[PDB]
Design a protein around this ligand. Structure first.
Ligand SMILES: *[C@@H]1O[C@H](CO)[C@@H](O)[C@H](O)[C@H]1NC(C)=O
Ligand SMILES: *[C@@H]1O[C@H](CO)[C@@H](O)[C@H](O)[C@H]1NC(C)=O
Ligand SMILES: *[C@@H]1O[C@H](CO)[C@@H](O)[C@H](O)[C@H]1NC(C)=O
Ligand SMILES: *[C@H]1O[C@H](CO)[C@@H](O)[C@H](O)[C@@H]1O
Lengths: 351, 148
């Protein structure tokens, strides 16, 4: 045998020892999953809700912009629908982590908007389109409105993008916890602590509380080191919550005022161009519920021993090899810590 | 005599969390042979400090896993008795691809009698995209009509 220390005879072979080892693996995974389930479901719920809510906000803002174009500037439709749809599509693409340039979104929006304004509103009556697109930026027809919208939307979209990525990475690491594979030595120690008593013919004897403590502090030496970075993750997320709904929803008013501004100088512009050519509540409740799990990694071995069958009295208990009267006495974790350091730096910089 | 122009500048690369990347550097022509030193974000790297990074006799920086040595602006610098010469900094960014999660359980039919709904969620968290990784491809929710 390679696990059960044979002191007397033994009622189990090597294959029964392997069966006990696999059952030890399954029991450890089940205990970790039971420890992590409440937090996993909390973060999954919040991630799903925030994702759907942001998509709803973007769709509603596109709808309101399209409706205000239909009502106030029918001469700019249906071209207005095309560039508004493209703009808010790129908005959603940026929110979901795709490489999109916010300044380029706004600049393409105004580049597409100016020629139809000139042809339908200022000079009623396709090839000259690019000359108008160039004149838009060369003559600064929209004034400071493009940079105003640029900063207004970049500031909110960056914090939203990083919020979603932080929620998803928290889900990732919490799913990794209960799937953390351990050393072979720990497998044998857990098999001894939970099952090797059955090989010696004992039926209801439980392992000593102190033996469970030494075993758990033995194989969770790496997992406990995650606690610093998990605490910093929680606190940095709290730093970030202390925004995007108001901006995307006022976009239509800002665009209308920019259109008024351009139409204000139509006299000179036409001649020159003719010549030349409940959210905040949710994130607050999320942070207040997430701060209840700041001790998750430090309390984990205590959970495994307090939810496994153990003799707390350390009397008439199993010490891994014999029944005693009293007890005598990285790679995946490295990836978890790498991603936590990354997301923590990313969080702290938006502050 | 030490030359200004580097024989071969390090190239910026995109590498997954597990991918391995080798940064090549050929120092400029000079007597004696230029001493190549690697600097991560204008700060030297210690080959003995980490198993993941090692410096080769032919001036190459090999990274086995993008976990123990994450992204940065790696720059190769040749030192000689004459002077020192800096190469073009390579922007090495580690990119994490989106990976689908398991199908959750079907929700109860909201309507007690007649046409009901059953939902199944599929999140992009196994693994979750990092440092501008490609997001998960396809649908996130599954809905089926149910008759109770
Ligand atoms: C916009 O809002 C109105 C309000 O009733 C609705 O009728 C219309 O279908 C909506 N359009 C879009 C594209 O959401
Ligand atoms: C962890 O992510 C994996 C993806 O294969 C999934 O199989 C599992 O159900 C997730 N974890 C939990 C604990 O629900
Ligand atoms: C690497 O080069 C880029 C070029 O934009 C620069 O923004 C950045 O400061 C450099 N270093 C770091 C730490 O990103
Ligand atoms: C998720 O979707 C399918 C599995 O159903 C695959 O194309 C791939 O593994 C993807 O990440």
């Amino acid at each position: 045998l390679q696990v059960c220390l044979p002191k007397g005879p033994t009622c189990c072979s090597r294959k029964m020892e392997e069966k006990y080892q696999l059952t030890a693996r399954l029991n450890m995974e089940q205990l970790l999953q039971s420890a992590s389930m409440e937090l996993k479901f909390l973060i999954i719920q919040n991630a799903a809700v925030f994702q759907e809510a942001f998509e709803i906000v973007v769709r509603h803002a596109k709808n309101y912009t399209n409706a205000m174009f239909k009502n106030n500037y029918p001469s700019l439709t249906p071209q207005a629908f095309e560039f508004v749809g493209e703009f808010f599509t790129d908005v959603s693409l940026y929110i979901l982590g795709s490489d999109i340039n916010v300044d380029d979104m706004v600049n393409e929006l105004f580049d597409s908007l100016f020629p139809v304004i000139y042809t339908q509103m200022m000079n009623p009556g396709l090839d000259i389109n690019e000359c108008l697109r160039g004149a838009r930026r060369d003559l600064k027809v929209f004034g400071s409105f493009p940079k105003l919208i640029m900063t207004q939307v970049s500031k909110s979209l960056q914090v939203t993008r990083i919020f979603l990525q932080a929620l998803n990475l928290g889900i990732e690491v919490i799913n990794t916890t209960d799937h953390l594979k351990f050393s072979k030595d720990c497998g044998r120690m857990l098999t001894r602590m939970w099952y090797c008593s059955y090989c010696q013919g004992l039926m209801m004897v439980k392992p000593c509380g102190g033996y469970c403590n030494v075993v758990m502090q033995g194989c969770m030496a790496g997992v406990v080191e995650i606690d610093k970075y998990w605490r910093e993750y929680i606190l940095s997320l709290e730093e970030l919550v202390n925004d995007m709904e108001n901006v995307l929803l006022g976009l239509f008013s800002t665009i209308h005022d920019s259109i008024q501004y351009v139409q204000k100088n139509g006299g000179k512009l036409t001649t020159t161009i003719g010549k030349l050519c409940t959210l905040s509540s949710r994130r607050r409740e999320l942070i207040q519920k997430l701060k209840s799990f700041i001790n998750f990694y430090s309390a984990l071995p205590g959970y495994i021993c307090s939810h496994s069958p153990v003799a707390e009295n350390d009397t008439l208990c199993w010490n891994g090899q014999e029944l005693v009267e009293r007890y005598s006495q990285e790679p995946v974790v490295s990836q978890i810590i790498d991603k936590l350091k990354h997301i923590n730096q990313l969080l702290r910089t938006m502050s | 005599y030490l030359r200004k122009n580097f024989e071969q500048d390090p190239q910026g690369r995109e590498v997954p969390i597990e991918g391995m990347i080798v940064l090549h550097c050929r120092p400029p022509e000079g007597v004696p042979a230029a001493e190549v030193e690697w600097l991560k974000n204008e700060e030297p790297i210690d080959s003995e400090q980490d198993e993941n990074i090692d410096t080769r006799a032919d001036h190459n920086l090999i990274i086995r896993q993008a976990r123990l040595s994450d992204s940065g602006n790696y720059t190769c610098m040749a030192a000689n008795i004459v002077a020192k010469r800096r190469s073009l900094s390579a922007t090495v960014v580690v990119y994490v691809n989106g990976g689908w999660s398991s199908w959750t359980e079907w929700s109860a039919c909201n309507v007690r009698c007649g046409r009901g709904w059953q939902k199944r969620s599929r999140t992009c968290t196994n693994p979750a995209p990092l440092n501008g990784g490609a997001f998960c491809e396809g649908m996130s929710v599954q809905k089926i009509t149910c008759t109770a």
